[PDB]
């Protein structure tokens, strides 16, 4: 059979009769406007289809044509600086082809433009007659001044080269390579079609060693992330789950960035494409905007719900595609809780039985099969490069409660957990990461990096996390008993920790100096606030009881100029690099001598 | 272009339970199709087709199934989806919840027929809201400033004056130093609530541009679903197709979702929290994200939806899900209403996400971004100090925290408390805000850098 007939439509799902030779997760086109849908259940002759567009007006007599292929994306040049929807239709080309402001929900726009010409160059060390396997580079295309889009063979096939294209300008439809493999000759182009629900093949997984530098101080120091790791950001509304997402997409160490808006706001993706073409960064002494390494998968909350599933798998396929070139990809999914609400609404139409709080029983398997596509890993192919995929997925728990079937299922999968607090947002304490409940599991994986470049930082965070918990164990005493009955080794603990929460942990994202903090500034200003805690320890412990001693009341009136130096270490712009390391020690020599006097 | 085939009429109902009527032997039924039911006594009822399966079509009537026969009722299938007649003369009038005139008026002459579900805006051609709306209220304009094209709800409760501050921001809506067409959806309101909004818009002379849609509590609950849908597709017409700045006021949004729970529980759909459906986030976002402004047009649409949280709970499914879609909220509180503050606005759970682009040198002036963060920080510490003097004592606090006591009694009485008709400008608000920061020393204002302290704190 070639095509089908609608039997019933109820919301997103469509039951289609006369559909016998159809496989699961095939792509179909239901209706006269050809709405893109995917088969999820079939009972003999009738198949059930979730539709990625609005089914409003679909009648029973509508045809459902089958494509014989799953939901896939086109991978090639024309993808950096672009913005797509869940099923990878380019939003910049969909608004010039129609000249409207809406998506006409019928349009089969090609994902990569078949008219724009790219300047292909060969591998230079790939002659005719050379053997070639799946996943090795056979050409270099410079998509921008920053991105060299390395053209690769698909991982399925292999052969012997019979024709390679000379260097010149080519479309995405021009034949570039011919491979004879059995004595069969298959043509190739600069685009390849890969299904989004299939994990990309790769040589072997690798442990992660290099950290991901987000730019925030509480994120880089206390709960560090690696490139190739999995991160989850839960939190209620107004906590700042997009300010962590925007500061990571602007100032991380990652080669390419993708940003998947899954059930997000419409204004928050328009916010991205405004300030990104003006924010330039410096890689080779040249300045180029960060939109040339950015690609957006925009599926807002107004857009249909089944495309939230497709926008997640579209992104992680683009994330794994630039992984294979040797780049260090970082993916931000916002929000993964809206993907979970999509699976609940689809399974409610199929009358499936629910797991805890409405969600289907296969919720934790969908999340596990998405976070496990991340990792630092040696790619397929002969030039022997290495790439990585970092996934930082925002979770939106209902009511700000972390006992949630989406949040608690996520915390069993991810390794880094940045718990955002609402009480830290009710006061203007940004970023709102709750230092008590947050954790990381790359600690043992990163200290082999930390005894090479910053050889003093691991004893620092062991004390800084001890001071912040010592404050919390005494904060319950003050609100019940009172501050006047404390000891002197505890009043120094509460004030140094208050200096840590105000200078080190608080960070204004829109000011010109704290919008990015390099790691020498992070280790630097933490090395002085803990040495000040250790120097004030000896003022209390060594002179303990006998003499009329330093009792910390004389400290806060005599160190009022020195405490003002400690509270102002955050004001060091990137207009100075070497001077900031000196002023970290120039503040320390004031700290060195004042304990003697 | 036009449907010209004659509509079919079926006398073939096969099941009716709850609000759902099940029609059999329908030939090619259509999803989301609108129908017309003719009762055996002659009253006409409309209905949407919510499920079709082969020859069967499950409709739901808007006015309820009370009296629907099995042998004698006749349903007529209008061959298109629910499209409302929208026009430019659909302005200056009062309509009911469904579609009909109220003030002894004609039906609209229908410049075009727009689908009430609309279609989502492409995010590539949706320009970010930048210009600021001066509402005349210091708690709004000073700390949580709204932009033109911003969705921002009023988080209220039962008994609090949310309708009074709704009419206030309508009279005083203006650009920071050609009027706003207000479309008003009244949903599940009392009669005295609808008379308050009618007599306020007929008082300030703005009723030549008011599009008031009223839907009282005696009107059926299934018509509350299509009530914001019709009130936003005229605002979509006036702003994207008629080039005019529109302010949409939705009330009560709690009465929308409680009416949404009744239809979902009757269809036996999967519940989320507290019995509300799982698709409540999507249904709330299909009427919230129809706001903002587009690139090729000079008109815009801003949304201020009023909702009353049940039992003062901000973690209820109503204000939690609307807090995840909108761009910051306004929290009118109850404990500030007992002290006879007329806007009882607790600024600590209030937010405006688009306030940062709407403040600055070109927008109002230099110190707006800095005095708002400092007034927020001194109110946050002084309220935690207020919970300490109630448990320990009024005298044994830190000497700095007695200034925090003196700040809070001057914050809640001079800064936010302004009266029902006083419309301060944004430059008046920052001038009153610096007077309350004057009682603090210069070096305790930590969130303000030393540069702009020199220009404003000695005065």
């Amino acid at each position: 059979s070639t095509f089908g007939y609608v039997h019933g439509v109820s919301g997103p799902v469509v039951t289609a009769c006369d559909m016998a030779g159809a496989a699961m997760y095939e792509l179909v086109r239901v209706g006269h406007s050809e709405l893109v849908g995917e088969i999820i259940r079939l009972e003999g002759d009738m198949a059930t289809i979730q539709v990625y567009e609005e089914t409003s007006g679909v009648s029973v007599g509508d045809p459902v044509l089958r494509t014989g292929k799953p939901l896939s994306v086109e991978l090639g040049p024309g993808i950096m600086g672009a913005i797509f929807d869940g099923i990878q239709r380019p939003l910049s080309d969909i608004s010039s082809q129609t000249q409207s402001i809406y998506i006409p929900r019928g349009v089969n726009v090609s994902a990569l433009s078949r008219d724009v010409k790219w300047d292909f160059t060969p591998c230079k060390n790939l002659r005719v007659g050379s053997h070639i396997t799946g996943g090795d580079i056979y050409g270099i295309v410079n998509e921008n001044s920053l991105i060299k889009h390395k053209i690769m063979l698909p991982p399925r096939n292999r052969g012997t080269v019979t024709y390679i294209a000379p260097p010149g300008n080519y479309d995405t439809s021009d034949v570039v390579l011919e491979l004879e493999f059995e004595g069969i000759k298959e043509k190739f182009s600069m685009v390849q079609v890969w299904p989004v629900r299939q994990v990309r093949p790769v040589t072997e997984k690798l442990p992660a060693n290099h950290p991901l530098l987000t730019g925030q101080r509480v994120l880089d120091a206390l709960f560090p992330c690696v490139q190739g790791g999995t991160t989850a950001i839960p939190g209620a509304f107004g906590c700042g789950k997009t300010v962590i997402s925007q500061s990571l997409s602007k100032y991380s160490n990652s080669d390419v960035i993708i940003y998947v808006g899954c059930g997000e706001r419409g204004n928050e993706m328009s916010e991205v494409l405004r300030d990104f073409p003006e924010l330039t960064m410096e890689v080779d002494g040249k300045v180029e905007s960060i939109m040339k390494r950015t690609a957006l998968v925009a599926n807002t909350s107004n857009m249909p719900v089944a495309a939230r599933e497709a926008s997640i798998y579209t992104g992680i396929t683009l994330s794994e595609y630039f992984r294979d070139m040797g780049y260090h990809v970082s993916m931000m999914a916002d929000s993964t809780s809206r993907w979970a609400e999509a699976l609940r609404e689809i399974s409610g139409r199929l009358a499936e039985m629910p797991a805890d709080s409405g969600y289907p029983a296969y919720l934790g398997a969908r999340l596990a099969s998405f976070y496990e596509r991340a990792g630092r890993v040696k790619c397929l192919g002969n030039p022997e490069r290495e790439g990585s995929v970092s996934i930082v997925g925002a979770v939106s728990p209902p009511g700000g409660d972390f006992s949630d079937p989406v949040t608690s299922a996520t915390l069993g999968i991810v390794q880094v957990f940045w718990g955002l607090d609402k009480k830290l947002a009710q006061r203007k304490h940004f970023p709102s990461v709750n230092w008590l409940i947050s954790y990381s599991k790359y600690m043992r994986a990163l200290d082999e990096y930390y005894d090479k470049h910053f050889t003093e930082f691991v004893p620092l965070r062991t004390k800084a996390k001890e001071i912040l918990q010592e404050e919390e164990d005494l904060a319950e005493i003050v609100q019940l008993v009172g501050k006047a009955s404390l000891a002197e080794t505890d009043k120094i603990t509460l004030e140094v920790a208050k200096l840590i929460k105000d200078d080190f942990l608080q960070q204004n994202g829109y000011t010109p100096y704290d919008r990015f903090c390099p790691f020498y500034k992070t280790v630097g200003m933490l090395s002085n606030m803990i040495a000040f805690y250790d120097m004030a320890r000896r003022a209390v412990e060594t002179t303990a009881q006998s003499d009329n001693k330093i009792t910390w009341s004389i400290i806060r009136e005599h160190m009022g100029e020195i405490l003002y130096k400690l509270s102002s270490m955050k004001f060091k712009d990137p207009v100075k690099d070497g001077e900031a390391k000196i002023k970290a020690d120039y503040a320390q020599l004031l700290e060195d001598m004042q304990n003697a006097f | 272009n036009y449907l010209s085939q004659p509509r079919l009429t079926y006398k073939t109902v096969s099941g009716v339970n709850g609000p759902l009527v099940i029609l059999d032997h329908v030939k090619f039924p259509r999803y989301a199709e609108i129908v017309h039911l003719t009762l055996p006594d002659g009253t006409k009822r409309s209905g949407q087709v919510l499920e079709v399966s082969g020859s069967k079509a499950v409709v739901q009537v808007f006015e309820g199934t009370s009296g629907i026969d099995a042998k004698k009722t006749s349903c007529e299938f209008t061959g298109d989806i629910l499209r409302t007649p929208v026009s430019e003369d659909m302005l200056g009038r009062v309509f009911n919840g469904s579609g009909k005139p109220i003030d002894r008026g004609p039906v609209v002459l229908a410049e075009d027929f727009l689908d009430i579900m609309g279609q989502p805006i492409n995010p590539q051609c949706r320009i970010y809201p930048e210009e600021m709306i001066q509402t005349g209220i210091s708690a709004i304009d000073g700390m949580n400033s709204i932009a033109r094209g911003q969705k921002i709800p009023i988080f209220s409760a039962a008994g609090l004056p949310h309708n009074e501050i709704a009419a206030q921001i309508c009279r005083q809506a203006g650009l920071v130093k050609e009027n706003f067409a207000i479309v008003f959806a009244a949903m599940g309101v009392n009669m005295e609530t609808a008379r308050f909004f009618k007599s306020d818009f007929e008082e300030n002379g703005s009723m030549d541009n008011v599009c008031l849609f009223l839907n009282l509590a005696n009107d059926p609950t299934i018509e509350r679903i299509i009530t914001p849908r019709l009130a936003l597709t005229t605002a979509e017409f006036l702003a994207y197709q008629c080039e005019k700045h529109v302010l949409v006021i939705l009330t009560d949004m709690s009465s929308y979702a409680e009416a949404l729970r009744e239809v979902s529980a009757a269809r036996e759909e999967v519940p989320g929290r507290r019995g509300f459906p799982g698709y409540m986030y999507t249904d709330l976002a299909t009427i919230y994200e129809r706001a903002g402004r587009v690139e090729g047009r000079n008109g815009s649409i801003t949304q201020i939806p009023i909702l009353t949280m049940p039992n003062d709970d901000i973690t209820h499914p109503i204000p939690d899900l609307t807090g995840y879609i909108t761009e910051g909220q306004i929290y009118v509180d109850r404990q500030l209403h007992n002290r006879q503050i007329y806007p009882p606005i607790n600024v600590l759970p209030s937010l405006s996400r688009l306030m940062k682009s709407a403040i600055g040198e070109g927008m109002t002036r230099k110190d707006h971004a800095d005095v708002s963060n400092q007034l927020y920080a001194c109110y946050a510490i002084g309220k935690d100090v207020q919970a300490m003097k109630a448990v320990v004592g009024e005298e044994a606090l830190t000497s700095d925290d007695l200034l925090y006591l003196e700040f809070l009694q001057k914050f809640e009485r001079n800064f936010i408390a302004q009266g029902p008709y006083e419309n301060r400008t944004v430059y008046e608000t920052l001038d009153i805000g610096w007077q309350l920061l004057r009682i603090f020393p210069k070096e305790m204002l930590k969130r303000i850098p030393q540069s702009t302290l020199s220009e404003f704190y000695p005065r």
């Binding site: 009358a351 039985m353 629910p354 | 036996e268 999967v270 519940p271």
Partner: peptide, 18 residues
């Protein structure tokens, strides 16, 4: 309640055909 009512709705479906 939602799980047990869904079982009873499916139990009438198999009973009606059989």
């Amino acid at each position: 309640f939602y799980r047990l009512k869904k079982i009873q709705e499916k139990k009438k479906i198999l009973k009606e055909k059989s």
